Design a protein around this ligand. Structure first.
Ligand SMILES: O=N[O-]
Ligand SMILES: O=N[O-]
Ligand SMILES: O=N[O-]
Ligand SMILES: [Cu+2]
Ligand SMILES: [Cu+2]
Ligand SMILES: [Cu+2]
Ligand SMILES: [Cu+2]
Ligand SMILES: [Cu+2]
Ligand SMILES: [Cu+2]
Ligand SMILES: [Cu+2]
Ligand SMILES: [Cu+2]
Ligand SMILES: [Cu+2]
Ligand SMILES: [Cu+2]
Ligand SMILES: [Cu+2]
Ligand SMILES: [Cu+2]
Ligand SMILES: [Cu+2]
Ligand SMILES: [Cu+2]
Ligand SMILES: [Cu+2]
Ligand SMILES: [Cu+2]
Ligand SMILES: [Cu+2]
Ligand SMILES: [Cu+2]
Lengths: 300, 300, 300
């Protein structure tokens, strides 16, 4: 199922570009590009990506920022596009296709705090998402969260599925071959990984005994819901979609729809390694287990 | 899988009958009937229906109304019945079968505000729901919703699946062949459609730039959950099951169980066409995309 | 797929042992054992169990109790282990394997009120859960629930799936063969059953006309979410995961993730038999229907 013009194509990752251009305005430039990603050991997926990552690079803006977004399409033959769930926009004017070897710029406001999916909007959308064109944009709430002062350390996790390569029958009708977590960096030194079955097991996220950890999470799908759970703890506080008003306490497991987000916070009380799962254990068995290593110092 | 006595049967739609009979009492009369519905282009499903619609006709009552419900069974051979999720009733006395060519009347109160599924209760219930015997009853809250004064325009949407015709193995064990939206009229001039893959794409719901839209939504299944999302906006306010107390804000996507309802409200800020999806994109690809056309005047 | 050392093995159920050892400390002793369970009429599953029950025996503790848990592994060849979702623990030190014919003791606090899953933690966790090593621990809130004084009668229900026997391909990739409810006793005289397709239909839970019923519920999976609904009523109050803060009202149906819990309360207004379902009707058809028989006296 490899398009003739994609045979042998493996475009090197290109860094995300972002710069603030006013107190409430931010420029973002991404690419659409075709990049080989190792999704399981020995298994390469020639993914349709933003910037050579799948999920794509993390975007963080402030509530009330208007985003001036440019997509540079490096794919030699397939059009691509961008839909941010954070924004208010006209889909038929602002989420439109950018043709091969062209760029397009679109402007829209991020009025709402939270942890939002982004993805390509090009028909068939299922094909673009399943092939890798998904990601997260975080919109920071103007007044924070009521538990901000309690949080010691924070990371971003994203859940996605992988199917048989570019196979629309499988995408529509088949079980996922792999379900995976990735982490995207918020601060210098944080890991930045792609959706694969192994990296966050072999290179766990790090924390220190006694810390309260915040995770910004989103299940991008394309197709499955997620039963998000951290082994050995309970979520002290949960904010559905990352909106501070949607505040639950003491949850064992957080139900995420496809594209669903949350801010979750939990305390790690003892040294050890703590798995992070979707509790739909067929999906966990097919890759969706990450690890958090908790040490007396927070160092590995 | 077509029952001998249903071969060639296509009973014309019969209008819902409703009339208020007291300040807190309402008569409703439906039929059970066998009616051909075009669920995808060129694909007829000889559905088991209420009133020749699938999902069935919309019912709207007020909180505290007692419903005096009559079902007239026009099916020549299969018994049918009615279960309203809105009501408090004895299932074994009030949700019982009405035999072919007979009628039955049942009385029960709708004590709780919200957006409730209704469906046939006849064993096997899966068979009756999958073949088309589902619908929505809205119970209006005595004191409204706190955001009532902000809403400019409102519609009803229902999600359902379609399987291989009357195939209990497929109903139990197979993926849906189609997943679809329909709209049911609240006010004169609103569309009133059946669950199909195309009508709400070709004849979009209409709105005006700047409006706040309310949707009353229910995912009737039979089998899937729904990740309900409007492209190009964020839900300002969500009331789970349509109960005013269950109030979320700023949600990108609303997780609906099978039979789950909600009242969702969102603002459309720019002219254009806005898709409405379940974000489980396998289901969207198999039909579950509706459209909302937003114009400077609200006219098409 | 029957391990040689399990052929012909059917270890008799062993009672749960629990005793309070201080105002905030409780001893619990379970077994891991291999026991034949009739999951559907004529269908024996040689389950991997705690104490010869699947789901395992109910555990009830108070918020703030530290649990001193001993597992005695009676399996001749497979290691087993215990993970309580209620507790804060080091998974790599406290949820570790107990080898055949050995015991292990682990101590950890239950700081959070609610209705929590427990299950084996031994890799592959999917295999242990699917084969029967799941259950519920209830942690009673120090200050109760705000609706405690309204509740007349209470029971515990658990939902689980069963797959082809010890078949990891089916566990990962196949639909469940059966989906089932069981009830676990809270007070003397309550039923105590295993996850099967028939017992709670033939021997319904009992209640009296006019009562408000509380159910403590958990969907242990392993793989499916649950759309929990009681026919003929509406949930007056719902507490997600059994935490009193997570308070919804007037829900028709409660969405439970895999491992998700709730406390749900509803009123039965008329004599009759009331089905209890997951509204994902493929699962209901494959076993997941229990019954509640409501009489003028509450006696059968
Ligand atoms: O909490 N691990 O299923
Ligand atoms: O927001 N369309 O996936
Ligand atoms: O309420 N029985 O689907
Ligand atoms: Cu300013
Ligand atoms: Cu600019
Ligand atoms: Cu694309
Ligand atoms: Cu989207
Ligand atoms: Cu701290
Ligand atoms: Cu915790
Ligand atoms: Cu009155
Ligand atoms: Cu009457
Ligand atoms: Cu019917
Ligand atoms: Cu129902
Ligand atoms: Cu307005
Ligand atoms: Cu919006
Ligand atoms: Cu004390
Ligand atoms: Cu002790
Ligand atoms: Cu085990
Ligand atoms: Cu678990
Ligand atoms: Cu009472
Ligand atoms: Cu009720």
């Amino acid at each position: 199922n490899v398009i003739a013009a994609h045979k042998g194509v493996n475009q090197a990752p290109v860094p995300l570009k972002m710069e603030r251009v006013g107190p409430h305005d931010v420029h973002i430039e991404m690419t659409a590009q075709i990049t080989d990603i190792e999704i399981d050991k020995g298994k390469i997926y020639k993914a349709w990506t933003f910037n050579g990552q799948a999920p794509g690079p993390l975007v963080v803006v402030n509530e009330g920022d208007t985003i001036h977004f440019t997509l540079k399409n490096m794919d030699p033959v397939v059009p691509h596009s961008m839909n941010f769930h954070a924004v208010h926009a006209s889909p038929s004017k602002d989420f439109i296709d950018v043709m091969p070897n062209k760029s397009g710029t679109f402007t829209y406001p991020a009025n709402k705090p939270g942890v939002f999916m982004y993805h390509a909007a090009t028909k068939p959308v299922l094909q673009h998402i399943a092939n890798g064109m998904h990601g997260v944009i975080i919109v920071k709430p103007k007044n924070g969260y009521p538990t901000d002062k309690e949080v010691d350390r924070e990371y971003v996790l994203i859940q996605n599925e992988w199917y048989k390569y570019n196979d629309m029958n499988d995408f529509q009708n088949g079980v996922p071959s792999y379900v995976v977590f990735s982490s995207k960096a918020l601060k210098p030194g944080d890991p930045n990984t792609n959706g694969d079955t192994f990296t966050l097991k072999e290179k766990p996220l790090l924390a220190k005994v006694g810390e309260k950890i915040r995770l910004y999470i989103n299940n991008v799908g394309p197709n499955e819901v997620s039963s998000f759970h951290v082994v050995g703890t309970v979520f002290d506080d949960v904010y559905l979609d990352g909106n501070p008003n949607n505040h639950l306490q003491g949850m064992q497991t957080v139900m995420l729809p496809a594209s669903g987000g949350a801010v979750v916070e939990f305390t790690v009380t003892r040294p050890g390694t703590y798995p992070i799962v979707t509790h739909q254990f067929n999906h966990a068995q097919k890759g969706a287990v990450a690890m958090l290593k908790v040490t007396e110092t927070g160092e590995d």
